[PDB]
Structure 1
Amino acid sequence: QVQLLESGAELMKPGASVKISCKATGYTFSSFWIEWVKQRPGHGLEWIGEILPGSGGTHYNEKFKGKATFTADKSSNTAYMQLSSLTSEDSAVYYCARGHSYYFYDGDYWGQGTSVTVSSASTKGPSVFPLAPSSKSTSGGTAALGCLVKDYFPEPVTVSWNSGALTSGVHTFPAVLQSSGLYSLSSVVTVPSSSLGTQTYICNVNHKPSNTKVDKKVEPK
């Protein structure tokens, strides 16, 4: 059906520039306005502006005039947003969304979002360690185990267990920025304290920003 695909995560140094793509699909690209919105951790949603691919008409929120510039490729049905002279304030996730057309509108469709980070630091792959399940028999019933994803940059990261096979009771914590300037989070899972030696689990921690992809297993004592 209709769908908007946004380019992948991006890291750029300050003073530099970036270009996000938004692939339209399943509808007439030219007649529908494309909205662009910014989302910073503590600022919720912010409106950057819109573009009418067909006519090329644009409407910029003054706050972004010059900072963001939209373009579109009618032949490839792809919209673009270029954030210039990037500073830390530009670090945020960016969405593109289909709005209205003169002959129709029944609600909007949203792109999955692009994460842009503005740092002079180089991308660092995560080191993952096992959160070895302690023989939890101390008056309870089940045991917990996980994976510690330490020192990576920038933000974008994902973890799983047994390849999403078993997602029953997993907990991935928001990443925490450390003093060293790197991030690190934890992914835990609680499984029947029983089936432990019977079945083993592996956390699939992949970090795009550096093409890292780990598949570490966790075993008891």
Structure 2
Amino acid sequence: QVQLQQSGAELMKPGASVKISCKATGYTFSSFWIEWVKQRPGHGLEWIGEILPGSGGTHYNEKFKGKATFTADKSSNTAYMQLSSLTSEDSAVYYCARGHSYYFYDGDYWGQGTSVTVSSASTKGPSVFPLAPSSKSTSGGTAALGCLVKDYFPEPVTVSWNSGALTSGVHTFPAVLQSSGLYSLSSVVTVPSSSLGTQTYICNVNHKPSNTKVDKKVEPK
């Protein structure tokens, strides 16, 4: 089967440039076009253009011509996209999809997406606090506990409970842009009040742009 491992999410400065990788797998790389679409926070999808690694030929979306520039390395079956002269408008999630071959178009296979933020800012790991299950027994039944991932930047942060183990009944809300300019988000879990004092859980917050890796502990009242 086919794959498309895109480089990781990143942060860059206005006026600077950024290069996104796209490692294609499970197919003859030069036969199919590699496509790039952009997706700014809550705004749909934009077709950036494409490139045929075999011939090196490219069809840019005029709106992106000059802004995005594609390249590709046959040696390693890796396609690239260089977004240069970055500005606020370029902060978005970019994807590379396996287009069609001018032979057989069995659809579009997509990469996971690479997050990109343009900012004269500095990355900053988060501070995770515990939201322990307190007197939430009043006319209730089950218990709610979770972690607060406070003030971090840029936008790509992931949370896991009990290391992927007991991750059922988990709610990880999307981040909210606070006054400080940092992001914050909360992650909670619904669980059997009974098992609240024996079995314990921990959230695993990861914020790559700063190489953070917190595995925190939550303890009730």
TM-score, with structure 2 as normaliser = 0.98
CA distances 1:65-109 after superposition (whole Å, capped 9, x unpaired): 100000100111110000010001000000001111122111110
Tell me which residue corresponds to 2:141.
Answer: 141
How many residues are paired up?
Answer: 221
Which piece of structure 1 moves more, 132-141 or 113-122?
132-141
CA distances 1:18-56 after superposition (whole Å, capped 9, x unpaired): 000101111010110111100012321000000000001
Cα deviation for residue 137 of structure 1 reads 2.2
Q: Is the 8 A contact 1:67 1:84 kept in 2?
A: yes
Tell me which residue corresponds to 1:14.
Answer: 14
Cα deviation for residue 164 of structure 1 reads 1.3
CA distances 1:135-159 after superposition (whole Å, capped 9, x unpaired): 3221121110110000100010011
Q: Is the 8 A contact 1:170 1:188 kept in 2?
A: yes
CA distances 1:95-143 after superposition (whole Å, capped 9, x unpaired): 0011111221111100111001001110000000000111322112111
Q: Percent of counterpart pairs with the same letter?
A: 99
Following TM superposition, the consecutive aligned residue runs of length 4 or more in structure 1 with deviations greater than 3 angstroms are none
Cα deviation for residue 160 of structure 1 reads 1.1
Q: Is the 8 A contact 1:5 1:22 kept in 2?
A: yes
Q: Is the 8 A contact 1:35 1:97 kept in 2?
A: yes
For 2:141 and 2:39, locate their aligned partners in 1 and report how far apart those are by CA, in whole Å.
42
For 1:117 and 1:215, locate their aligned partners in 2 and report how far apart those are by CA, in whole Å.
26
For 1:52 and 1:83, locate their aligned partners in 2 and report how far apart those are by CA, in whole Å.
18
Q: Is the 8 A contact 1:136 1:193 kept in 2?
A: no
For 1:42 and 1:160, locate their aligned partners in 2 and report how far apart those are by CA, in whole Å.
24
For 2:140 and 2:129, locate their aligned partners in 1 and report how far apart those are by CA, in whole Å.
26
Which piece of structure 1 moves more, 136-145 or 70-79?
136-145
Tell me which residue corresponds to 1:120.
Answer: 120
CA distances 1:171-199 after superposition (whole Å, capped 9, x unpaired): 11110111111000000011111111111
Which secondary structure does the structure 2 equivalent of 1:4 belong to?
strand
**C-alpha spacing 1:128/1:139, structure 2 compared with 1 (3 Å):** same
Cα deviation for residue 204 of structure 1 reads 0.6
Runs of 5+ in structure 1 lacking a partner?
none
For 2:171 and 2:200, locate their aligned partners in 1 and report how far apart those are by CA, in whole Å.
17
Tell me which residue corresponds to 1:70.
Answer: 70
Q: CA RMSD in A?
A: 0.8
Cα deviation for residue 168 of structure 1 reads 1.7
Q: Is the 8 A contact 1:159 1:204 kept in 2?
A: yes
Runs of 5+ in structure 2 lacking a partner?
none
Which secondary structure does the structure 2 equivalent of 1:33 belong to?
strand
For 1:171 and 1:137, locate their aligned partners in 2 and report how far apart those are by CA, in whole Å.
20
For 1:205 and 1:42, locate their aligned partners in 2 and report how far apart those are by CA, in whole Å.
23
For 2:157 and 2:21, locate their aligned partners in 1 and report how far apart those are by CA, in whole Å.
21
